[PDB]
Structure 1
Amino acid sequence: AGECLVVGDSTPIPSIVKLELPNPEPRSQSIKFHKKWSESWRTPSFEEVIMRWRKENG
């Protein structure tokens, strides 16, 4: 984790490098399953905007 293969013409020895931690780190598009399940049942008020599914057709 955190290491890459720098293979190319710009290096004498293509090697694996220990990249440092970026600052600031980008947005992480990850959803954790169990913690969300660990909470009580999500009770969504039914505004019922399925026009999301419907009108986004083109």
Structure 2
Amino acid sequence: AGECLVVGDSTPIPSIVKLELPNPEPRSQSIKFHKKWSESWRTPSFEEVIMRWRKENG
């Protein structure tokens, strides 16, 4: 994690380089499963969502 190899003519030796963490981090959002569970009951609204399924208010 956090390492990549740079291969090209700009370097004498293609090597693994430890990249420092960028600041500020871009909004890297990947949904995680479990914490959404065990949170009582979630009730989405459906009129609007099936309305969007029909390309009405997309």
Under a length normalisation based on structure 2, what TM-score does the superposition of the two structures give? 0.82
Cα offset, 1:55, TM superposition: 1.4
Structure 2 unaligned segments of length 5 or more: list them: none
Identical columns (%): 100
Cα offset, 1:45, TM superposition: 4.1
Q: Equivalents in 2 of 1:18, 1:33: separation in Å?
A: 30
Greater alpha carbon shift after TM alignment, 7-16 vs 46-55: 46-55
2:38 corresponding residue in structure 1? 38
8 A contact 2:51–2:57 mirrored in 1:
no
Structure 1 unaligned segments of length 5 or more: list them: none
